[PDB]
Structures are given as C-alpha cells and as structure tokens.
Scaffold this active site. Structure first.
Site, PDB file in Angstrom:
ATOM      1  N   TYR A 149       6.560   6.003   2.236  1.00 35.34           N
ATOM      2  CA  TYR A 149       7.451   6.040   0.923  1.00 35.34           C
ATOM      3  C   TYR A 149       6.871   5.816  -0.134  1.00 35.34           C
ATOM      4  CZ  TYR A 149      11.063   5.025   5.014  1.00 35.34           C
ATOM      5  OH  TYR A 149      11.715   4.772   6.135  1.00 35.34           O
ATOM      6  N   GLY A 150       5.693   6.161  -0.152  1.00 38.33           N
ATOM      7  CA  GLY A 150       4.810   6.011  -1.245  1.00 38.33           C
ATOM      8  C   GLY A 150       4.359   4.717  -1.592  1.00 38.33           C
ATOM      9  N   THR A 151       4.269   4.527  -2.814  1.00 41.77           N
ATOM     10  CA  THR A 151       3.687   3.215  -3.414  1.00 41.77           C
ATOM     11  C   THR A 151       4.998   2.593  -3.060  1.00 41.77           C
ATOM     12  OG1 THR A 151       2.381   4.037  -5.122  1.00 41.77           O
ATOM     13  CG2 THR A 151       2.997   1.764  -5.114  1.00 41.77           C
ATOM     14  N   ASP A 175      -9.243  38.227 -39.969  1.00 43.43           N
ATOM     15  CA  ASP A 175      -8.108  39.040 -39.663  1.00 43.43           C
ATOM     16  C   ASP A 175      -6.953  38.027 -39.223  1.00 43.43           C
ATOM     17  OD1 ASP A 175      -9.501  41.379 -39.352  1.00 43.43           O
ATOM     18  OD2 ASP A 175     -10.406  40.654 -37.738  1.00 43.43           O
ATOM     19  N   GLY A 183       2.173   4.887   1.459  1.00 43.58           N
ATOM     20  CA  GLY A 183       2.203   5.599   2.614  1.00 43.58           C
ATOM     21  C   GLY A 183       3.323   6.548   2.734  1.00 43.58           C
ATOM     22  N   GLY A 229       0.802  -1.400   0.062  1.00 39.47           N
ATOM     23  CA  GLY A 229       0.053  -0.030   0.269  1.00 39.47           C
ATOM     24  C   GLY A 229       0.797   1.337   0.081  1.00 39.47           C
TER      25      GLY A 229
END
Ligand SMILES: Nc1ncnc2c1ncn2[C@@H]1O[C@H](COP(=O)(O)OP(=O)(O)OP(=O)(O)O)[C@@H](O)[C@H]1O
Ligand SMILES: Nc1ncnc2c1ncn2[C@@H]1O[C@H](COP(=O)(O)OP(=O)(O)OP(=O)(O)O)[C@@H](O)[C@H]1O
Ligand SMILES: [Mg+2]
Ligand SMILES: [Mg+2]
Lengths: 291, 259, 638, 630
Positions: free
Chosen positions: A13-15, A136, A11, A9
């Site tokens: 330390y990320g993924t 224009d 948290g 999961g």
C-alpha cells in the site's frame, strides 16, 4: 479519518503512514492506493478496492488481533498514486504567429509587448554570450507561452527544418530579415535585433512592419520608415547596388507603429536603422527604461 | 595534486547551462553543430598549413640540390648566390608554415575535451540473454535435494516470514528474499504450524497459518497465470490491497482450499 | 621497548597542492573567500575603533573594492581593513591552518558583537585556483607596509614598503591564469559576488571600464563604473521584528526575488536556542508558472551562515508542499565543512526545518483571520495546501483547518470546514460531500437530491487533488466525512419512511432481480435508494475506494498503467428510484412480461445513462449512440 | 635586502583538528580508508613477490581481518601487508599529506599490473573521526615489530612491540569513542562494507562472537567479484547472469548485458544490464536513482544516476569502474561533473546500440518493449537529440495487424503509392478506436491506421511529426485527407449545396455548442460526428490533461480546440432533417432532435459532456414518451 502523526515503511500500500483514531485513539496503518473508477469494460465505481478496504475494516471488526489494516472506511490517500508519485508535463506549442493570430487589432498593449520584448532580449543576451548564430530566426521561431514567456528556438538553417519545410524560406517576403541579410553579409547582434524589431512592430500592428519583393525592394520598404542615404553609409558586405537607392527621410516610428511609445520608437528605430553599427545591442535595449 | 587536465571539458548537451527564454531542445543541437563546424575549420586549417610547409620544404630541398649543382657548375656560383637567397626564402616560408603548425599545436593544447577527444570505444560487447534452451527439470527430483537442504538453509528465514502480519512487511520481506517464494517454503510453514499446535503455541500457529496462506496465495495464481511465483509475488500484495471484501474473503476461501 | 615520542609532521609540498587542487570544486569561491577575509579585517577595525576611535586616524571609511585589470590579466582587491603586520604575513598568512581571527575570537571578550566569518586558516590558498600568483601588500597600524609575495611554490616572500600608499588594510594582487580571463568580465564578476557577498556588512564596489559613447564631445559618456549597487540589499532579519515595517520589508521581498509587487504573507522567525538563527518567510501573491515543475532544482529558502550564502537545499530546509515560500535562513552557529559548501551533520537542518514549518503553519493561521487575503492566498496555493495535507501526515491537524470549500448552503461563498461543522444539525453527525468534474456537475448530481431534501449541507469538491484529500480527510472536528456518491449513505431520516422504502423494495423486488439479470456482468448489485429523487436510477459508488471522479484522474494521469490495480479495484452498483414513473412502469412491464426484450433493452439503456449521469464511461459509446440513432429512426419513421 | 624568503609553514596542531573534523562529513568511511590502505599494502606484497617469492615466507596469504571487540569497545583491523619500518612509521604514517603508496607507485614505474590508490596521504587520520585513539602495530619484513600509539594529540609514540608476533603487515586498534559503539554492530559494519568495500580485490573477513560465542570468520563478507575487470570475451552468460543477480539482488537474470569501456584521457570499464521486468516503483519521484553505480579502481564513489543516465533510461542496472577520476579530498565527491555528462553520452550511445540489437531479437524485444515502452515514449518526449533513434524502437498495433505490434517503418513500407501521411487514432482502448467512425472511411479507402491507446501517446505523438519522410495525421481532427475521386468530389459539392441550409439551421440551433457544422465523407455508418480543430487539445488530450491534479486550468484558454459537427449526408436521418428543414426549419421537435444528435455524437466521439444529468433527462423524457407515461 484518523489523525496521522508518523510513517510506516513502503510496501504493498506504498508509503503507509501512521495515525490514531480521532475518537478511540487506536493506531492504524495509513495504507493507500491509487484510485481510478471504470475502464474499457464500462463504468464501475474490475473487482474492488472499494470493498478491499472493507476487508481491512472487516479485519478490524474481528479485532484476529494481527490485522494491520487500511485506515477508515475508505481507501485513504496517504500518498496515493499506485503507490508511486510521478509527473509528466506538456510542451508548449503556442507559436508567436499563433499568438498574433489570437492577438487583438493594431494597438497591442505596449506593456505586454514590453514584457515579451525584454524576455526576448534577455534570451538574446544569453544567446550572444553563447555566440549563438541564427540570422534565420523568424517570428515563427519565437514561442510565446500561456504564462506569457518568450522562448527562442531554431538557431539558423544549419540545425533546423530537418523535416518537411518551406520551398521559399528566403524567397518569401523577408520583412523580418535584417538589411545585412538582404545585403548577403552575416549574423550579428544588430542583425538579430533588426529582425525582431520588425516583429515587435508586427506585434503592435498585428501585421508585418514592412513588405517588399526582392532584397533591394525589401529595403525600399524598410527605408521608408528608417530613412535612406546614398553610398556613404553602407557596409562593405553589400551584394545589393548600394548608391542606387535614392535617399529619403524617416517616418517617426512612434506615429507609424500603433501604441509605440516614443522610448520604444527610439529603440525600434535604432534596431531598424540600416547601418548595423548605429543599432542598439540586446543588452542595451534590455536595460533601457522602456522595458 | 593536479586535476587541471579536466578543467576544460565541453559538453554540448549541458543541461546545467540553460536559460528561461531559450528552448534548449534546439540549442543543444546548435551547440553540437558549432562544435563540429569548429573542428572542420580547425582540421582544414591544419592540413593547409601542413601542405604549405611540405611544399616549401620540397621547394627548398630541390633548391638545395640545385645549389649543389650550381656550386659545381663552372661559373654557376653567380646563380648559386641568387638561388641561395631564394632557397633561404623558401626555408623561411617553410619555417613560417611550421610556426603556424606550432600555433596549431598550441590550439590543440587549448582544445576543449569532449566525447571525441577524451576517449575512444576501447571495448564494446553486447549480449542478449535469450534461451537457456527450452527445457524442463523434474521438480520432484529437484525437491528431493532442495526441500531437504534449501529449507534447512533458510529455516530461520522461512520462520521469519511466518512471524509477519503487515501486508507491506510481507511484500518487502519477499522482495528482499525472493528466493523464498516457493512450495518448499509453504510446506515448511504448514509443518511448522503442526509443530506449534503440538507445542501449545497457538497464537503463533495462527499467525504462521496466515502467512502460510499468503505464500500459498502467491503459488495459487502463479500457477493460474503460468508464471514463476517469484516474478509475480508482488502482484499478490497488489491483488490483496485491491481485492473486494466479499471476493477477497472468497479468494481467502479459494486460498484456504488451494493450501 | 623504549618509547620514543614524535610530533606529527606535514608534507607541505603535497599539502599545499592538495589545498588548492582537492579542497574545492567550484572556483567561484575565489572571490567569496577573498571578500570574506577583507570583511574580517574590516570587522577587526570596527572593534578596535569601537573601543578606541583613534584607531581610525589612518582611515575611517570601511569598504571592499574590486578593480579588474585585463591589460595585465590581473585583479585587485582593496581591503580597507585593519591589515597585517610583517609578522602576520609571515606567521598567519604564510602558515597553513593558521588564522588571526582566532586571536580575535579569544581577544574579543569585550567584542562579543564582533563576528568573524570562518576560521580554518587555509581559504587564502584557494586564490591559486585561478591565480598564477598572489601578492598581498599591507600595512597594519602596528607596522609598516610590506608586500607579501608568492606563487604557492612551497615558499613565499615579504618585501619592504614600495611606496604604493597603503596605510591600512591590504592590496591583494591576483595574477590570473591564461584560461581564467572570464573573471575579468563585468558579468562574470557580478554573477559570482551576487551569490556569495549578497549580505556583506561592508559595501563592495567594482571599478569597471564604463561602456560609453565615443569621447568625441559630439558626445561623451563617463569613463568608469562604480558598482556599489552590489550591496544595496541589506539584512532584515537581523533587526527587531517589531521595528521592521513593510515600507522596507516589502522592498526586501521585491529584491529577494525579481518580483515587482509586494509579498502576500510573511513571517519573521527568531530562534534563540542552540541552533540560533533568524529567518524570513515570504509568500508570493501568486503562484509561479513553473510551480509544479519538480524537475527543477529548488532555491526558495536559502541558508546563510554569518550572512553568507552557503546552501539552498530546500529539499532539506522545507517540505515539498511548502516549496513556494521564499526566504532567508541565517545562522552563525553552523558546522560547515572545510569547503564551506556543505553543512556537516544534516540532522541540524532536520531540526531547523521542523521549527520553520511550525512558523509556516502559524503564518497560515494568521492569514486565516484576514479572509480577503486569505482567500487570495488560499486560491493561489490551494493545491500546495492540499499537497501538504496529502503528504505531511503530522501537520494535517493544522493544514486541514485551512481548507475552504463551496457547499450547498454557502453556494458561491467558499467556507471553512470548521464553519461547516459548527453549523451542522443535531442529526448531522457526518460531513456530507461530493466530488466530481465540476461545480455545476455535482451541484446537479442525483446523489445530492435527497441529501438536500433531508436538509444536509454538501461540500462540493472538483480537483483531482480534492479527490485525494477526501480519501485522506474523513473526519474533521470530531465528525466523519461521507460521500454522497457512496453506497450506505445513511442520511438521518424518519424510520417510517425507511419502512416505506422497505415496502417499496418488496414492490420492486422482482424488478431489481430482473434488472440484475439483464445487467449480469454489467453491474454487481441492483438495488433501491431514496437518495434519488428526479432520476429513476443511478450508478452509485461503494463505501470505499474508486469513485465517479477518480478514473478521469488516475487512469489518465498515472504513467504506470498498473493493470493489476486497473483490473482489481472496482465493482458497480445500481440504485433504483422506486418513486420514479419509469421505475414504476418497469415494474409493471416486468410483471406483464419479464421476458420482454424491449423492456430489457430499456433497462440497459437506463443503465448506460445511469452510468453517464453519474460520470461513468461506457464500454462502447458508439453502440450507445447507435441505440440512440435507432430510437431516432423509429421516431422519424425511418 | 628588500625582500626576505620564507618556506611555507603549516600549523599541524590546527591542521590535524581540521583533518578529523572539517575535512570529512561522513564518519563510517574510516573503514573504507583503512581497508583501502590494507589492499594497497597487499598489492605491495604481490608486486614484491613477483620479483622475489621468498618475500612470501612471512605468510603467503593476502587479506583484511575485521575483529570487533565490544568488551573494550574497540575495533581490531588486521592488515596482512608488508608492514612499516620504524622509519616508515615516523616518516609516512606520522606525516600529513604523505604516503609511501606513491613511492611504491614510483617503484612500479618499471612495469607492473599493480593498481593502488592513495594520492592524498591523509586517509589514516579519518580513523580519528570515530576512534578516540589509534594504535598501529606493525612488522615490516625488513624491520622489527613496533607499536605506534597516538590519540591525534599533536604527537605519537613508537616502541618495539612485545608478545604476539606479526609475520608481516600491521594491526590497527581503534579505541572507539563511547558514542561510536554502533560500529561494533554486525549490521552496521556490513552496511559500510557493502557501501564501499563490495569490490575490494582482497578477501575481507568479519569476525563475530557467535556459536560457544567465538569469533566466526565471515569469509563471504566481500565475496562479490568484479566482472568488468575480466575479459568480456571470456565471460559466459551464466557469469553475467550471476553478476546481474548479485548486483541487483534480483532472482531473475537479466534480459541483456553489454560491456563497455573507453580509452584515452577518459578511461573506464563498465557493464550495462537490461532487466527482464520493470520494478513496481519504476516511476517513483522519491526513488533513489542508483541503478548504475560509479567506482574508481573498484572503490565506490557515488551512484548519482540523476546525471549519469537519462531519466527515461532509469531502469538499466550496472557498474561503471573508472581508472582515474578527479576526486575531491573527500573521495565521496567528484570534481568536474561534466565528466559524468561525457560518460552519460557514451553510455546512451551504447544503450541505443543494445536496444537496436535487442530489436533484432524480435521475441525478446517484444518482451522488453512491453515492459519498457513507457520509458521509450518518455525518451521521445524528453530527448530532442536521440528521438529519431528512439522512434525506430516504437511499435504499435495497426489496422492491418492483429494483436501484434508493428514499427512505424513497417507501417511506412505498407503505405500506398499516393499515401503521403501516416494515419492514426488515439484513445483509451483499442476497441474504442477500432469502432471509431473516424477510421471507417479510412478503411473504406483501404488505409491502415496506427492504434494509440496509451495516455502517454498524446505526448509521444506530439513529437512524432514526421517519420521516414512521411507525415502523420489524426483521423479525429479536421482536415482528414483521403483519396478524392473527382466524380465523388463533384457529388460532394452537390451534397454540400443540398444540405447547405440544413447545416446553417443546425448551426443556428447549436450556435454556441459547435463552431462549424458541415458534411464530410470521413463518416460511414454514423449520421454525424464531432471533430477537433488542428489547433489545441484533442478530445483525448483534453480528457487526459484534465486528469492532472497539478494542472493550471487557465492554460485551457490556449488549448481549447474548436469543435465541428461532421455530417454524413448519406443517412436517412440527415436526409430527413434536410426534408424537415424544408418542411419547417422552425420545427421545435426537429430542433430538439438536432440538439440530441449533437450531444449523442459529441459524447460518443469522446468529448466532455457538459451535463450528463440533463442529457439523460432528455433520454428519460423520450423513454416516458415511449412508455406512454407523459
Ligand atoms: N585581506 C586580508 N586582510 C587581513 N588579513 C588577511 C586577509 N586575507 C587573509 N588574511 C589572514 O588570513 C587569516 C585567515 O584567513 P583564511 O580565510 O585563510 O582563514 P579564515 O578566513 O580564518 O577561514 P577560512 O580559512 O575558511 O577563510 C586571517 O586571520 C588573516 O591573518
Ligand atoms: N596495511 C598497511 N601496511 C603498510 N603500510 C600502511 C598500511 N596502511 C597504511 N600504511 C601506511 O600509511 C601511510 C599513510 O598513508 P594514508 O593511507 O593516510 O594515505 P593514503 O590513504 O594512501 O592516501 P589517501 O588519503 O588518498 O587514502 C602510508 O604511507 C602507508 O605506507
Ligand atoms: Mg578568510
Ligand atoms: Mg592509504
């Protein structure tokens, strides 16, 4: 170092992913953090993730058997970026004018122009489908990206130049404006294409196709290439003294404009033709074998 | 059974209707403009048609008054007939203005839905949560009630934290259970460790002690930073994942001392 | 009490409106479902004529024609299929949740190769999404011509043969709504059918008013357009892979996506398991300009059911890092929901994805043999590889094998890590590498000087994504990776020379101490390393985490300036080269006077240049340059 | 005659199988549909009791009771509604695409505050997605109690029930399939409840066999109440705070809240919330965009913020509860997504208003800005239509400020009467740019610059071309315009001639290192400095863009801005060099110095150094010369 096989999961330390030690087979938390280096305080290598994982490996050395810790002797990249992956992209400011300033002398690769031409015309088909009015539109409203993509912007005075602009947006030589502009009529598919038609010739020459002073004088330069008739091939919406434009012949666009392949010379001549109803639509030109 | 009322919604910034060769940064602005100009043209037309209708209405109304007068007039009936025809034409004109207005009504029925036609600002109420008045409560009095009931209420949840080991599980756990980031929680964990020692559950005790210092760590720099622990507990797991072996162990030493 | 039995009922008056109004959100399915029904009827004939050729006595040609009629605001679908009987119009066509395709599902025991598309018995009624009224005129060979007619008002009618020659299939008259006139436009018709009838077995043509020169012949052009072209692209994966050559397969790719150049690498995938499907994988010869524009919706791998485009959810069909492979997935065994816009039970696609990825990896491995085109492939999608390596944990065992790098021994030749490993020395137990801002930077780094002197090969890495991959990949073929930029770079060397270094450490012991004091709060540890040869000193990174190339990358790229991480993640170490003339001099100068500020300033200068030479930023480059200018002035006598 | 007329038919046997197989994708929604039906019936009671209170004699309580039964592997749902008569069971319950909810809504046409759903008439059959068999037992106030039993096999049965009495309403027995026992799990049930039943008007309870293992009445199952349904003027800060905290699960209350409702063809009520702090995963590409959730009649439909709000506003938490949206037969999906785009636009307008009012509250704005200025700047980058509004929210540190940020409009209010442009400088740090040579003359001329120290500022300033009629100019680029006293101008032209050949010499020395060598009064304390051409990347932009892992390196051919060597003619070094050029322009030592100075300037100017090693090697050589080494 460890061979990753699964995922833990998200948290601190990320993924955090999950691996096994290539040699011992022991499982490990594939923890990850972003990695910069120094900062405003100088270089480095601001405290130390560079040994934080050493803590985590130190914890491994203890074997304290409740130490889920970051894999291998480095702060491994197992989905890095804080952790948090995010992207940001640069806007392309490569104005067609800049392109032409960066472009080579008269004889600009017809094939490059063909690609940019069909990109432009394809863009027009969209714009015509969406009834986008922009008589224009001028060279500088055409974006040429680093990938060689034409992008159109600034659709008419109604929604452009909300900030500092030119004092002579009209007075300036309108060699890129259709006769219908010079005649003070309106916007149409042929108007748009007349404008860029000269731009395409500019691209080939790396230099404006025509160059007059007044609207009538501008036509006096236009007519030198496309030919001129008396007051019998002029539209109803004409502010200019139609009939006071002494008739003259055309000058084979193929020979006038550098590397202008005859097929494109025909397409251009059709785009340049004075009478808007004798011109070719963006779709028709787009689908022409020339492109 | 019928949602056709919403089959004609016009969105000027519709990012799902774009093109590779078109810069929508200005296209969307063009679309806005076109919508506005069309509404202006529409409104102008409607008002002019209404004006014309009312003019012809008044013209024929006054002519009808005159028809009554011409009828009464001794021989004015010759003029009456002339005026009747003229009044009929004025009525026919009025009618045609109204027919055009009916066509305008049809145009309204065909009108695309947008932020100006779908709805209005039914209600709007802003509020900035400034305050709740510079104040302060006696944490010992709060504790007197909190420590006694909060800890029991969340006793199992405090224990669940103490049973964690992964740094990431600890972060997520407290992220989900932010109300546990406090001294009362840490105090229980210390007491629990003592009880575990007594119960000869040293393996658990050690892990609870690890988590005890995690909560104490959160409290430690929350106090140093002068912020609510629950506002920055995530930065401790950020600090943990970033702090040096020597200095994080040194922080663990400072931490053990803080406990 | 007494148990009464009741049959379930259905309030058709409401049900019908729900079928039309609540079953679909995208009205483009109008033509899809109409065409699908026509192709089913054509499949019905194929079978019947297959087993009995006389079934084609009333017509052999099998096709689907679409003729728009703007003057009526109607559309005509010409189904040359088997058609329906009066009874079928009443029973099948006129009944909700009723389909004769099921009859063929059961009847066609011999017709195992006859695959009808869909089976709900309700799609017909979606015609009224855009049509005010629908008339179905048909003549099945077993009956006469009848005109089924209804506006979906709770009833329908059937009329007798009106004389409009239909001896086969059916004419579907689509009376369009006032606000549905956009379906009378050529462009719009093409837009829809290209996304839905792309792989219909039978050819679909349009009969359109042909744009032409005024009929003044003087000039004149043809009056009508026959748009057969809609089905010029045929199914390829349906044929035998061994019998499919590039003369047609490469053409498929070029028609698959608007690319006037044959593909780079491809892989046919045949699945004969529960989830039977076939798929074609296509790798472009170059990366697209918008390759990394992840803000855009993916559409490279598309999912077809029974050769009908259903989904293009690449997010589920493939990995993010494989979002360059374009292709077709075609299954006839998928549980689509009632709308047929979404596959039920997404776990199916989870399995399909895994299976496809395996073939992607096999394709990559096949490519590795073709070094010429491999290098082309590799360079075109090296980032994607490295992204897979970065993200896809499970398959790094194959993805890391695809890595190719320039090294100190290969030079300009990009080589495999497996080649690196196979050529490692008996003392070379770890893979040495260096990352940096550029090749010539790391190729001239102080960090690789001794490494080269010790005869070790250094892998040169330069991308930010490489900087990710080096953190991730720290072992390959059994040997770990060691950055030469890191402290603790245990190169294999003569123990006696290590002793010499220890004697040098004693020699420069006081120097290291002094320098540390000079550089207090500038550097964590000043020490000695023989990794340096030509340099007197060098800021060296630590065994873990942040490295020389990393700030450049993350500090500037990350949008989140996580100042905690920014302020919690790097020390500083200074290596000393005890053999360098300046270092030698500094020792002598320290011994002469450790308090000589000029020497101390020199140390600071050297420190700042050590930072510079190792690719580190200074805390105030302007004061660095100021010192330089001061020294210049001294040299100039200013 | 020539035509026969038929009524449309429906093959119920197939239709039913389509209903419980193809009409739905998710299956856990069976609770939503059955609970919704319960709440409809509970509203039926309420209304009826408004006209006749004695209808409450058969029970005065309105609620939904969920009682799992693992011993049977079934689920009992007790709906305390009015109930269904025998006729209703066989007419409404037993009929596809039919609901008496509408008939009740027809009764409600006489005037009521009642709000029910159920226009499809098929929700009941979703029970068979999960249950093998369903038994419905009911007791209408005006009829007997009946049991209704069917396994959805084309038929159903009705019989008067026996045993336990029902005062009113109906009970649903879900004979759950053997592989659907996961719905007997507390967590799984609560998951679905929180998913679609979190704002049901009536009490929903969950009975669990817990301490003594008896069915414990979880009354708090859906204790969360609707707030936007209440009159905002009667809602206190404490109530808004509690809602936010419940909404987001954040212990900390919100920074700001704003109620917003629209009326007309589109109609909804909503609450928007600004968080006091940014989330650690704010910019995660894989993060579910569910900050603001979408409801119809307080029934959860979806939370796709990808379209509901701008990405740069993807931090605002909230609830939007519409009154009537074109939901598909599957309520989980909404038809006509353009509606959401309309809603978005309306929300954005109100967010901007809230931001403006927040800006009025300087102290809390500062807090806000510090947390979400990144998002603001992303808005400047992304949103071409509200950029102007967003630019008013921008705040930067400037020369005349301390560590207090100031708006661009405040900068404008302090511009000189001859100042036509906003001076600014970008970089990595405030101190870095504060010590830049580029702002020294600017300060000497009495001008304020804007300090821009964030990497995103390169993208932000890319769009900040003009503000309040004032142009913007970087001090780091060529063409920096500062007040030019005609006297000084003459002196500068004299200086240009004075150092003309010197500059030419320097160019010859560094022909391929610098595009142009020239003097400039933009410099004060420095002998020289490298500037960036107005075309292409700035030194900062170069450094930053080089960071991007996924950047296409070939694009640099269009972005490599020209470098020019500015020279400050007032320094002894520059003057010496001029003199040395006169003494001997071919003097190698002088040439080496020129190269040194260039690299020194380039490096200290923030430009990429080609070879740090060689640069330091020169330094080492010079050090050795100073040391007398060699
Ligand atoms: N053009 C056609 N030719 C012959 N039969 C048709 C045609 N259109 C509709 N039908 C009848 O409709 C039946 C089923 O059509 P319908 O599309 O409504 O269901 P389906 O195609 O089986 O699946 P779906 O309902 O998803 O399309 C066919 O079996 C056939 O009887
Ligand atoms: N708790 C209840 N008390 C009384 N009647 C009920 C109850 N629950 C369901 N019903 C009856 O069930 C019948 C079938 O309606 P059903 O709920 O399937 O349609 P719906 O759910 O109202 O519509 P939708 O499909 O849009 O939810 C309704 O006529 C309603 O009277
Ligand atoms: Mg069909
Ligand atoms: Mg219901």
């Amino acid at each position: 170092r460890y061979e990753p096989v699964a995922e833990i999961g998200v948290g601190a330390y990320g993924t955090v992913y999950k691996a096994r030690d290539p040699h011992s087979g022991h499982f490990v938390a594939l923890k990850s953090v972003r990695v910069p280096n120094g900062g405003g305080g100088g270089g480095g290598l601001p405290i130390s993730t560079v040994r934080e994982v050493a803590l985590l490996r130190r914890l491994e050395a203890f074997e304290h058997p409740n130490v889920v810790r970051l894999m291998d002797v480095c702060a491994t990249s197992r989905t890095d970026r804080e952790i948090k992956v995010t992207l940001v992209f640069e806007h392309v400011d490569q104005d067609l004018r800049t392109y032409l300033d960066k472009a080579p002398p008269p004889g600009l690769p017809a094939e490059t122009i063909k690609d940019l031409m069909r990109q432009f015309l394809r863009g027009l088909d969209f714009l015509h489908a969406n009834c986008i009015v922009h008589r224009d539109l001028k060279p500088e409203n055409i974006l040429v990206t680093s990938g060689g993509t034409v992008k159109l912007a600034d659709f008419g005075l109604a929604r452009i130049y909300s900030y500092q602009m030119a004092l002579t947006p009209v007075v300036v030589t309108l060699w890129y404006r259709a006769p219908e502009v010079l005649l003070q009529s309106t916007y149409a598919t042929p108007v748009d294409m007349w404008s860029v038609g000269c731009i395409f010739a500019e691209m080939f020459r790396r230099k404006p196709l025509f160059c007059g002073n007044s609207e009538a004088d501008q036509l006096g330069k236009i007519f030198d290439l496309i030919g001129l008739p008396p007051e019998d091939d002029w539209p109803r919406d004409v502010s200019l003294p139609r009939g006071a434009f002494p008739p003259r012949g055309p000058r084979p666009v193929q020979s006038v404009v550098p590397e202008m392949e005859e097929s494109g010379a025909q397409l251009l001549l059709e785009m340049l033709t004075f009478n808007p109803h004798k011109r070719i639509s963006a779709f028709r030109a787009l689908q022409h074998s020339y492109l | 059974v019928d949602y056709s009322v919403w089959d004609h919604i016009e969105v000027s910034d519709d990012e799902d209707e774009t093109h590779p060769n078109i810069d929508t940064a200005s296209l969307f602005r063009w679309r806005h403009q076109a919508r506005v100009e069309r509404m202006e043209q529409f409104q102008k037309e409607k008002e002019e048609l209404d004006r014309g209708c009312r003019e012809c209405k008044r013209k024929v109304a006054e002519c009808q008054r005159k028809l009554k007068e011409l009828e009464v007039a001794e021989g004015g009936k010759a003029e009456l007939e002339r005026l009747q025809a003229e009044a009929q034409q004025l009525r026919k004109e009025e009618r045609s203005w109204e027919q055009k207005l009916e066509e305008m009504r049809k145009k309204e029925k065909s009108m695309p839905w947008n932020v100006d036609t779908l709805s209005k600002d039914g209600f709007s109420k802003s509020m900035v949560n400034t305050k709740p008045e510079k104040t302060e409560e006696d944490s010992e009095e709060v504790r007197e009630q909190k420590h006694k009931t909060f800890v029991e209420k969340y006793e199992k949840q405090i224990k669940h934290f103490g049973m964690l080991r992964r740094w990431d599980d600890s972060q997520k756990y407290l992220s989900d259970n932010v109300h546990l980031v406090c001294e009362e929680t840490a105090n229980y964990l210390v007491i629990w460790c003592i009880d575990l020692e007594v119960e000869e559950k040293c393996a658990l005790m050690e892990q609870v002690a690890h988590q005890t210092i995690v909560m104490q760590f959160i409290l430690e720099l929350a106090k140093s930073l002068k912020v609510d622990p629950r506002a920055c507990f995530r930065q401790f797991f950020t600090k943990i994942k970033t702090a040096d072996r020597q200095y994080m162990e040194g922080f663990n030493d400072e931490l053990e001392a803080f406990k | 009490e007494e148990v009464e039995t009741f049959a379930f009922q259905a309030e058709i008056a409401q049900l019908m409106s729900l079928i039309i109004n609540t079953f679909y959100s995208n009205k483009e399915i109008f033509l899809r479902e109409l065409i699908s029904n026509a192709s089913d009827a054509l499949d019905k004939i194929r079978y019947e004529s297959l087993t009995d050729p006389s079934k084609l006595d009333s017509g052999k040609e099998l096709k689907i024609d679409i003729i728009p009629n703007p003057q009526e605001r109607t559309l005509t679908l010409v189904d040359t299929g088997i058609g329906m009987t009066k009874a079928d119009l009443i029973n099948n066509l006129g009944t909700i949740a009723k389909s004769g395709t099921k009859a063929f599902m059961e009847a066609l025991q011999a017709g195992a190769d006859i695959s009808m598309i869909g089976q709900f018995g309700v799609g017909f009624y979606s015609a009224y999404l855009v049509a005010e009224k629908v008339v179905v005129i048909t003549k099945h060979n077993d009956d006469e011509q009848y005109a089924w007619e209804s506006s979906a008002g709770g009833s329908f009618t059937v009329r007798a043969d009106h004389g409009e020659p239909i001896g086969r299939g059916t004419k579907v008259i689509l009376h369009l709504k006032e606000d549905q006139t956009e379906y009378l436009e050529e462009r719009r018709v093409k837009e829809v059918v290209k996304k839905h009838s792309q792989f219909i077995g039978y050819p679909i043509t349009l009969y359109l008013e042909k744009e032409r020169e005024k009929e003044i012949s003087k000039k004149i052009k043809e009056k009508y357009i026959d748009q057969e072209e809609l089905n010029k692209t045929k199914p390829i994966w349906t044929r035998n892979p061994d019998d499919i050559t590039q003369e047609e397969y490469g053409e498929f790719y070029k028609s698959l996506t608007n690319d006037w150049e044959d593909h780079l690498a491809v892989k046919h995938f045949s699945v004969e398991g529960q989830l039977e499907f076939r798929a074609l994988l296509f790798i472009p010869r170059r990366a697209p300009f918008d390759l990394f524009e992840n803000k855009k919706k993916k559409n490279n791998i598309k999912l077809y059911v029974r050769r009908v485009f259903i989904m293009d959810s690449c997010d589920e069909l493939i990995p993010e890092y494989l979002n360059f492979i374009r292709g077709v997935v075609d299954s006839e065994d998928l549980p689509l929901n009632i709308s047929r816009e979404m596959l039920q039970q997404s776990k199916i696609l989870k399995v399909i994805r895994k299976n496809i990825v395996k073939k992607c990896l096999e394709l990559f491995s096949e490519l590795a043999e073709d070094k010429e085109n491999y290098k082309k492939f590799y360079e075109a999608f090296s980032k994607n590889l490295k992204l897979g390596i970065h993200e896809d944990s499970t398959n790094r065992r194959r993805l890391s094998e695809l890595l190719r790098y320039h090294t100190s021994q290969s030079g300009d030749e990009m080589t495999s890590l497996s080649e690196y490993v196979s050529r490692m020395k008996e003392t070379q137990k770890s893979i040495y590498y260096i990352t940096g801002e550029s090749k010539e930077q790391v190729a001239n780094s102080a960090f690789v000087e001794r490494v080269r002197k010790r005869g070790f090969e250094v892998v040169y890495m330069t991308e930010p994504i490489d900087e990710y991959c080096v953190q991730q990949l720290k072992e390959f073929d059994g040997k770990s990776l060691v950055s030469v930029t890191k402290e603790g770079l245990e190169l294999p060397e003569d123990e006696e020379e290590k002793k010499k270094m220890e004697e040098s450490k004693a020699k420069f012991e006081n120097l290291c101490k002094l320098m540390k004091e000079i550089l207090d709060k500038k550097v964590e540890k000043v020490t000695i390393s023989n990794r340096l040869v030509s340099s007197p000193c060098c800021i060296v990174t630590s065994t873990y985490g942040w490295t020389a190339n990393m700030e450049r990358i993350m500090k500037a790229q990350a949008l989140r300036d996580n100042s905690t991480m920014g302020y919690m993640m790097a020390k500083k170490h200074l290596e000393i080269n005890p053999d360098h003339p300046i270092v030698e001099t500094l020792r002598q100068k320290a011994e002469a006077d450790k308090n000589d500020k000029a020497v101390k300033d020199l140390v600071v200068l050297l420190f700042e240049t050590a930072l510079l030479s190792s690719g580190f930023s200074l805390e105030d480059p302007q004061t660095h340059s100021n010192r330089i200018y001061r020294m210049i002035k001294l040299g100039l006598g200013i």
